[PDB]
Amino acid sequence: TDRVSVGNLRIARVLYDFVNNEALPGTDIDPDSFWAGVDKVVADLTPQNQALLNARDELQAQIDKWHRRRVIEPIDMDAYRQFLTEIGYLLPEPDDFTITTSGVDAEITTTAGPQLVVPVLNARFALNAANARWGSLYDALYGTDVIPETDGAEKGPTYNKVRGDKVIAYARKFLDDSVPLSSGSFGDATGFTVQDGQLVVALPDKSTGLANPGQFAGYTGAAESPTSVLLINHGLHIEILIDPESQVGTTDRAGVKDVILESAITTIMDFEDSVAAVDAADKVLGYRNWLGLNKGDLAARVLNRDRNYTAPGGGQFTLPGRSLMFVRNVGHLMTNDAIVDTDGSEVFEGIMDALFTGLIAIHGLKASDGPLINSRTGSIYIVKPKMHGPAEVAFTCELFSRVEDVLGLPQNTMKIGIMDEERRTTVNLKACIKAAADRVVFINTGFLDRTGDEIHTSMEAGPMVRKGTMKSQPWILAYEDHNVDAGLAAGFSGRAQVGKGMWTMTELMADMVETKIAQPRAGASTAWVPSPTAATLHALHYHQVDVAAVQQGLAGKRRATIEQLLTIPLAKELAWAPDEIREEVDNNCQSILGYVVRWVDQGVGASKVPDIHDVALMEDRATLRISSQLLANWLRHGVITSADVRASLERMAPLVDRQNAGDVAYRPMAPNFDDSIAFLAAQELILSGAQQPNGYTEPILHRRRREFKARAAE
Numbered sequence: 001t002d003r004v005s006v007g008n009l010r011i012a013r014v015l016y017d018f019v020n021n022e023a024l025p026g027t028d029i030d031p032d033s034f035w036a037g038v039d040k041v042v043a044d045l046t047p048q049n050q051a052l053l054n055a056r057d058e059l060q061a062q063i064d065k066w067h068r069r070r071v072i073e074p075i076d077m078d079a080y081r082q083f084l085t086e087i088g089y090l091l092p093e094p095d096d097f098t099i100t101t102s103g104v105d106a107e108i109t110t111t112a113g114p115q116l117v118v119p120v121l122n123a124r125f126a127l128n129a130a131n132a133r134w135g136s137l138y139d140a141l142y143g144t145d146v147i148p149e150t151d152g153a154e155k156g157p158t159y160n161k162v163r164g165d166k167v168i169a170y171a172r173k174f175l176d177d178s179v180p181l182s183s184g185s186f187g188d189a190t191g192f193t194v195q196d197g198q199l200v201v202a203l204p205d206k207s208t209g210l211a212n213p214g215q216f217a218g219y220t221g222a223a224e225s226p227t228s229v230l231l232i233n234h235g236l237h238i239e240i241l242i243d244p245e246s247q248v249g250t251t252d253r254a255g256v257k258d259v260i261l262e263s264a265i266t267t268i269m270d271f272e273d274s275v276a277a278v279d280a281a282d283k284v285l286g287y288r289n290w291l292g293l294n295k296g297d298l299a300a301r302v303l304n305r306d307r308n309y310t311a312p313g314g315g316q317f318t319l320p321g322r323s324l325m326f327v328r329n330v331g332h333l334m335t336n337d338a339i340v341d342t343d344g345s346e347v348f349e350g351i352m353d354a355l356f357t358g359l360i361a362i363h364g365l366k367a368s369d370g371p372l373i374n375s376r377t378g379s380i381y382i383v384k385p386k387m388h389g390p391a392e393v394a395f396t397c398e399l400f401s402r403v404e405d406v407l408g409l410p411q412n413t414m415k416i417g418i419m420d421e422e423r424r425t426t427v428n429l430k431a432c433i434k435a436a437a438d439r440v441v442f443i444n445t446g447f448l449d450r451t452g453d454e455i456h457t458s459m460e461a462g463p464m465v466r467k468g469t470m471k472s473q474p475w476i477l478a479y480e481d482h483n484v485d486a487g488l489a490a491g492f493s494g495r496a497q498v499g500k501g502m503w504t505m506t507e508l509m510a511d512m513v514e515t516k517i518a519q520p521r522a523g524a525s526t527a528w529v530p531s532p533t534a535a536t537l538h539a540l541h542y543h544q545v546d547v548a549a550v551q552q553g554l555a556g557k558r559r560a561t562i563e564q565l566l567t568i569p570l571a572k573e574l575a576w577a578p579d580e581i582r583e584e585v586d587n588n589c590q591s592i593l594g595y596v597v598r599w600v601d602q603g604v605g606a607s608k609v610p611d612i613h614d615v616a617l618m619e620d621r622a623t624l625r626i627s628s629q630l631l632a633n634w635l636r637h638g639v640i641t642s643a644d645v646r647a648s649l650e651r652m653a654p655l656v657d658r659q660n661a662g663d664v665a666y667r668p669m670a671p672n673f674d675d676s677i678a679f680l681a682a683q684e685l686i687l688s689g690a691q692q693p694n695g696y697t698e699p700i701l702h703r704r705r706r707e708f709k710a711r712a713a714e
C-alpha cells in the first residue's frame with residue numbers, strides 16, 4: 001500500500017504530500033498537530049454524521065408508507081401536516097431572533113450584485129471568475145444576443161460598426177437611467193472634465209453636472225482631460241473609459257471607448273455539483289487550484305491586481321480588482337477513498353473538505369506574492385450544500401468549530417452559506433438559520449436540487465408534473481418567497497446575503513436581461529450567473545432595482561404558508577397525450593445522457609450542454625437529480641414502461657453523439673450501448689432512481705466514473 005498511517009486513518013500519499021509540501025507551509029500550523037487533529041475530528045464526528053444520514057432514511061420510509069396506506073387523493077393537508085409533526089420532520093418554529101455573524105466583508109453584508117459559481121477543478125475558468133469583478137459592458141453587449149442580430153447588425157469575422165453603434169446607444173441609455181444628468185442625456189455628451197471636485201459633462205449647447213453629484217466617485221488621468229470617469233450607483237461602480245484613439249472611441253461623440261461595470265462581486269469556487277472528483281487525485285487537483293487562488297499565484301493567465309483611482313477632490317484610493325471568494329464544500333452524504341480507515345472504509349468527504357479547504361483558506365487571509373487576496377475582515381466563507389433540517393446545520397457548525405481548533409483559528413472564523421435546497425430545510429428554515437446564527441453569511445434557494453428533493457420525497461404520492469412545469473408550481477413560488485421572508489426576519493438586511501438561483505441558458509442573454517430582473521425585485525441581494533459575461537449583464541439589474549429599498553418594504557411580511565410549501569406537485573388526472581409523454585421522456589433521457597457522458601468519460605461536471613432543442617444549458621449535477629427522479633416517478637406510477645425508457649435512451653444516444661462533434665476526446669455511445677459505461681450509468685440512474693437516498697446521483701456516478709477510470713488504465 002502507498003497510504004500514510006496517522007492513527008486510525010490511512011491517507012492517500014498524493015494527498016499527504018500535497019498538504020505537507022503545499023498547503024501547510026506558511027500557515028504556522030504544526031504538521032504533526034494538524035494530522036492528529038484530522039484523525040481526532042474524523043473519529044469524533046463520524047458517528048453523528050452517520051446517525052444524521054440514517055435519520056433521513058427513517059423519515060423517508062415513514063413518508064413512503066404514509067402515501068401507500070392512503071387511497072384518497074383529495075389529500076388532507078391537516079392530516080399530512082399533523083403526520084409530519086409527529087414523526088419530527090416538521091419541527092416547532094422558534095421565537096424571532098437576529099443573527100449575530102461578525103467579521104464579514106462589505107461585499108457580503110452590504111453590496112447587492114451578481115454571484116458567479118465555477119468549477120474549482122478548471123483552473124482557467126476559476127481564474128476568469130476571480131477576475132470577473134470588473135467586466136466590459138461593450139464586450140458583453142456586442143458579443144451576445146442582447147443586441148439582436150437583425151439585418152445589418154450581425155456579428156461577423158470583424159467589427160460591424162452598425163452593431164457597435166447599437167452597443168453604444170444601449171450603454172448611453174443605461175447611463176441616463178443609472179446616473180442621470182441634471183439636464184440632457186449622456187447620448188449627447190461631448191466631453192468629461194473634473195472641476196472643483198465636480199464632474200462636468202459637456203453638451204452641444206451647454207454643460208451640466210450629475211443630478212446627484214454624490215454618484216461621482218473618481219477618475220483617472222488629468223482632471224482637465226481624464227482617461228476615465230468612475231461613478232457609483234446602488235453601491236456598484238461604473239467606469240467610463242475615454243480614448244478617441246481607439247476603434248470605438250474614434251467614432252464616439254465623446255471619445256468613449258467602453259463602459260466597465262463592477263460585476264461579479266463574489267464568486268463561489270465549487271468542489272460540489274459542478275465538478276467530477278471521485279478519488280484522491282481529483283480532490284488534490286481541486287485543492288491545489290483553491291490553494292493557488294488563495295495564495296494569489298494560480299497561473300493557467302494570472303490574477304488581477306487592485307485598481308487605482310483619483311478621488312473627486314484629488315486624493316488617491318484603490319478598489320478591489322478581484323471577486324471575493326467562497327468555497328462550496330460537498331455535503332454530508334458521500335465518502336471518498338482519499339482517506340480510509342484500517343478496515344478499508346472510506347472517510348466522509350464533507351469532513352475532509354472542511355479540514356482541507358479551511359486549511360488552504362488561511363493563505364487568503366495573508367499577504368500574497370502584494371496585499372492579501374481574499375478576506376480583509378478575517379473570515380473564511382464556506383457554502384454548505386444539501387443539508388436536511390436544523391440538526392444537520394448544527395452538525396455543520398460543530399464540524400467548523402472543531403476545524404477552527406485544529407487550525408488554531410478563532411471560533412466563528414469559518415462562515416456558512418446555507419443552501420436552502422432540500423424540503424426539510426425549507427419547512428424548518430428559521431430553525432436552520434438559528435442553528436447557524438453566529439456563522440451564517442447567506443441563504444440561497446438552490447432550486448434545482450430542491451426540485452429533485454421535492455420529487456423524491458413524494459415519490460409514492462403519484463405521478464409528478466413535467467420538468468419544465470416545475471419552475472411555476474405553487475410549492476416552488478412559495479419556497480422562493482418563504483426563503484426571502486425568513487432571511488429578512490432574521491435581520492439579513494445589512495448583515496448577510498439573501499440569494500437566488502442560476503440562469504442556465506448561457507446563450508440566451510436577451511432573455512436573461514428581460515427576466516432575471518425578477519430576482520432583485522423579489523428582494524434577493526444576490527443571484528447566480530454562469531459566466532463573467534452573464535455577471536456583467538446581470539449587474540444591470542442591480543442598477544435598475546434598489547434591493548436595499550425592496551428589502552425594507554418586505555419587512556415583516558409573511559407571503560408563504562406552510563400549506564403552500566407543502567403542496568406536492570402531483571399531475572392532474574389525464575394530464576398528457578401520448579405524444580406529449582414521449583416528448584417529456586425524450587427530453588429527460590437526452591438531458592441525462594448529455595450530462596452523464598461528459599461526467600463519466602471525461603470527468604467534466606459542468607459545461608455548455610445542448611438540450612433536446614439545441615438550446616445551450618450550463619447546469620450542475622442537480623439537473624440530473626431532477627431528470628432521473630422524474631423518470632423514476634413516471635415509471636413508478638405507470639405513466640411509462642421500461643421499454644419506453646430503453647427506446648428513448650436508444651433514440652437520444654446518437655443525437656448526443658452528434659451534439660458532441662465538439663471534438664477529440666469523445667467516444668460515441670451508439671451503437672454499442674452495453675459497452676459504454678456512460679450509457680449504462682444513465683440507465684442505472686433511471687432504473688435505480690427510486691432507491692437512491694433522497695434521489696442523490698453521486699453514489700452511482702462516482703462508481704461509474706471510477707469504473708471508467710480503472711478501465712482506461714488497463
Ligand SMILES: O=C(O)C(=O)NNc1ccc(Cl)cc1Cl
Nearest residue numbers: 117446447448449502619620622
Ligand atoms: O440549483 C441547485 O441545486 C444548485 O445548487 N446550483 N445550480 C448550479 C450551480 C452551478 C452551475 Cl455552473 C450551474 C447551476 Cl444550474
Ligand SMILES: [Mg+2]
Nearest residue numbers: 421446449622
Ligand atoms: Mg444544489
Ligand SMILES: [Mg+2]
Nearest residue numbers: 234543545546
Ligand atoms: Mg436608485
